[PDB]
Amino acid sequence: SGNKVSRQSVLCGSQNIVLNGKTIVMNDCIIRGDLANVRVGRHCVVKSRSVIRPPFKKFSKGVAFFPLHIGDHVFIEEDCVVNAAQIGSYVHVGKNCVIGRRCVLKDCCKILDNTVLPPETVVPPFTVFSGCPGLFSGELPECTQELMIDVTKSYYQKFLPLTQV
Amino acid sequence: PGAVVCVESEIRGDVTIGPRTVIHPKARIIAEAGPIVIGEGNLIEEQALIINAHPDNITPDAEKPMIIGTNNVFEVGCYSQAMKMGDNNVIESKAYVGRNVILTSGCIIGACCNLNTFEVIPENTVIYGADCLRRVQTERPQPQTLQLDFLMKILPNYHHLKKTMKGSS
Amino acid sequence: EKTAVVIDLGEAFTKCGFAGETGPRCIIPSVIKKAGMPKPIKVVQYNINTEELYSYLKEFIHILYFRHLLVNPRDRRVVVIESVLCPSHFRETLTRVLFKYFEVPSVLLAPSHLMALLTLGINSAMVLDCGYRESLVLPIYEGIPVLNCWGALPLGGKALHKELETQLLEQCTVDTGQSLPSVMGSIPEGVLEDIKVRTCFVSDLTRGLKIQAAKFNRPSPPPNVDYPLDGEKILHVLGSIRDSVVEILFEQDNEEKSVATLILDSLMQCPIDTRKQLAENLVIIGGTSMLPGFLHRLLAEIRYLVEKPKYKKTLGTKTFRIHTPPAKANCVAWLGGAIFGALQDILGSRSVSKEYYNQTGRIPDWCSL
Structure with missing residues (x-):
């Protein structure tokens, strides 16, 4: 009900796909859950041109990859190729980002713009991601990240209300 | 026939795809300039932009039809605007092929990698994602036995995943 | 008891680690990465503002000890391997940063050739x-x-x-x-x-x-x-x-x-x-x-x-x-300083301490008096 899905956005595999309350799918989004399921958290803002593709078929005899996930208050930036990443709640994904195979994003993370998280890259909680090759830039503040996520959730709710159908 | 062409995917001009080819959703295959040629078992992922270079000038002709090799794993969001490719070449996501190219067999392009215009990539050499033309890391990508076996395993996983996707519909 | 710190500063690279270990733990280059900056600035520079150098040295030391050493140097001694004829201005700045900001127990400004x-x-x-x-x-x-x-x-x-x-x-x-x-x-x-x-x-x-x-x-x-x-x-x-x-x-x-x-x-x-x-x-x-x-x-x-x-x-x-x-x-040069610091808790006494620095003024360079 509360989830504002855009008209230009596409959600392939509706049974596999999953959208929590107060969600926001921007225009030209692609939540392709044909092969596997895609779980979106509450108050999660998926920005425009975001390719939400399923990680694996989940039909492998041994060591099948985890389909998709997204914690609450997840600020997914525009043009972000989210694939096979278990995003912890309050994860701030950067613009033009790229998630790897079975990448574990921790709580209160801050992915930089134009980043590339590699396969099986376990990011630590309260830490800014940086570099061309994934690495720890520095420890992030708890109060500043929570305030920015609250402001982003309020702004997305206003755009969710009007001008989309 | 015998190629998984998606409904959302777009094709234009002459385009002869090989056997067991997989065209993913929202994939552009603009072959208006010249007749496109996709190899057998070549997987084109979603949001991919297959372009061609306008060709046939008498003195120093610019290009010819972009011939993709067999078992070529083109990742999602990959640009391939007029680049000659070899068999068993794994182009990563968000990549960009040059205006003219010669990608040899057993390749492995990195993510967010700008492949060179008028540059022939050597046989058996994995490209680092960021700064172009990185010579390091070309042992595990050997020209065969190591990369041919890995690409055969990658082609099997791609065919198995595409078969599961085709079964789901 | 307490394995001392070893530093070997320079314009190109910086060898750093623990005293006693055969070879250093890491060697990050001398430059630093700043937010909102086109090019990376070199830390070790000569003939330049005092307060700017002090801030540059703090910034380099802060990024160093977390990544390299994984410890507070407040517990144990330090060996700063300055090359002989490294400007006295630069040594004074190093002495200030180590004692005023961080508050280490001891420091040492010994030559590179003798340790080698x-x-x-x-x-x-x-x-x-x-x-x-x-x-x-x-x-x-x-x-x-x-x-x-x-x-x-x-x-x-x-x-x-x-x-x-x-x-x-x-x-x-x-x-x-x-x-x-x-x-x-x-x-x-x-x-x-x-x-x-x-x-x-x-x-x-x-x-x-x-x-x-x-x-x-x-x-x-x-x-x-x-x-x-x-x-x-x-x-x-x-x-x-x-x-x-x-x-x-x-x-x-x-x-x-x-x-x-x-x-x-x-x-x-x-x-x-x-x-x-x-x-x-x-x-x-x-x-x-x-x-x-x-x-x-x-x-x-x-x-x-x-x-x-x-x-x-x-x-x-x-x-x-x-x-x-x-x-x-x-x-x-680094390995020599590691030999000098690790073995001898006795030869740590000849080097300048925090108690001596505050009352006196500075580590004694090879000069008059």
């Missing part, structure tokens, strides 16, 4: 440290460094970088994105370091003389290989160029000076009883000495200079042996 001598385990040696900025000589005899016998030409890493930048700009061959020479005016330092490590082949004495003869009125030009570069602009670098860049390090004429001649000038200044032991124990350390096929070209050039009439009348027949160290050529 402690690695060999001999009391007398002629030493040469070819770093980034300068190529410093300093003979040690029976522990004490003989100071007035010395030499340091501006002919280290930075001189080789400048020559590479000059010669590549004169003869350039970049691919399209073929021709098009001298498109880009300059090139970055990190790339130019990687070219020196990989491409630059050091020539022999006979090859070097043939190159010098060719420059002033062509033999053995190969081999040549291209170097890959970012943004789809591969440049076809030549084989005669990189050999010519290496040759200027050993160029005698019109200065009467080179890396080889600097040892002979240092030996000339030394007294007669000291002379023979320094000649027997000739140690080579530093960054430039890591280049492939360097120690032969030096030893052969040294011998050729001794054969010349001007050095026969003083030096004459001498057994020039190059006793090499346990660790690599760049990381000899």
